[PDB]
Amino acid sequence: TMTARSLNLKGQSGELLSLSTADKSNDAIGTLDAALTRISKQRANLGAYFNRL
């Protein structure tokens, strides 16, 4: 894991000091589910691994 684990969307139309903007709001919400899903699965992989040990 790292921030590039999910689609790393920050900021929004309007004033920024960056050169990037967020994408389709609905997909940004979906992205956060993806972020959580990807890490939750990795934690569970460790969880399951612990139970194996």
Place this chain on the structure above:
Amino acid sequence: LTEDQKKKKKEIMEQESLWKNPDFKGYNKTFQELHQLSKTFANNQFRLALSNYQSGVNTIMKNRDWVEQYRKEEAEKKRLDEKWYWQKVDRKAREERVVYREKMKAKQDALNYFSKAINHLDEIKNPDLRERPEFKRLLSDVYRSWIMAEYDLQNLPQTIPILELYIEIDDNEKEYPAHKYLASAYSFEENMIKKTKGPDDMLFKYRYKKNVHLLRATELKYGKDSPEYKHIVNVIN
């Protein structure tokens, strides 16, 4: 007209054609030339960059076909629940929103492909190869389609770094549409600062860059010390 005015008229029309919204005749011409250039270039990373660029343009072309088909299918429906004017307005807005959402996804997929085309061109490290007309032609085509994909959806601030990279390549700076788009996108950003009551440094930065590219586009299409050049200079100064 003089030999320079005749030449200029010819070139501006070719440049307007160059930035023409994509269609099947332009697609065919573009990819037939790019594949011949790829065979001349004989570089696997250029070949891969072209394969991805073409996939990106195909996403755009397939989307254009979808938009016509979708609007057609909607037009052909009987609407029994459209009895009031406010219902017609609502349903019209619902159609436009679905079309915009799908075009947004097509843009996202097309830019993922364009990004891959650039990532493959980045892998050509030899400076004698990066200076090849084949390399600069493809890189220019990738940036041009990228700019247009965002432009169509009004994502104008996002077009600036790509337009700026575009004009740095092989005399692209002498293209009237390139300066027209830069000036328009900078104008949008100036207006955003005025509407959101943002800092003065950004107001003037964006206004300045609008005026530079406004005047340069004018110079390129009409000529230095033309009635049109003289006018824009006098308004700005």
Place this chain on the structure above:
Amino acid sequence: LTEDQKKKKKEIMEQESLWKNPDFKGYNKTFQELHQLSKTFANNQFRLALSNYQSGVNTIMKNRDWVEQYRKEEAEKKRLDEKWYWQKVDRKAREERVVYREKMKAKQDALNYFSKAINHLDEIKNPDLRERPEFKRLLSDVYRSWIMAEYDLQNLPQTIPILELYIEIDDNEKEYPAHKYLASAYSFEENMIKKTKGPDDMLFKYRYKKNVHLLRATELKYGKDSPEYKHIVNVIN
């Protein structure tokens, strides 16, 4: 001007150059001349002293390269969590403090090498060799870099015993920068006594020594009983 004032002007500029912050042309020039001393001297402990000094200066030069690279790498990061002034100040505070602490380590490594350079010169016991221009100039360059390494990090009290040892060697007392740094470091120590409410004996000791080296620096650069000297006369009173 007089023949001595013209000569003096030339010498002050050469002395300012002598105390110039290190760079690659000065590095080369310095090690040309310090190696020239090794040529005539033909003394293994002098050779070792120079080998360590050069390693110390290399530490300083490598650090200067690190500082540019570090600041470059930070500048080239995308800062998406930097929407506030305080966040810009935060990231600024991150950058500068890491750079200062890394420079502190480079200073310590450089001073361990300079200490070794001195310990090797300490092993030259023959008074006919210790009085050699080769011995004195190298020892002077080791002290000068030592003084400057501490000065850059604001470690001014630490510069005093080394400046004092420096001016005792082969007419170094006639160097304007040497007296300027002594006067500045003594001024700091005077201010430390005033800020920490320390003893009067140390207040006056540090004030006195500041004025002595202020006066001597003035005398050396402008000449005694010059409009500039005459001014210092009444100020020190």
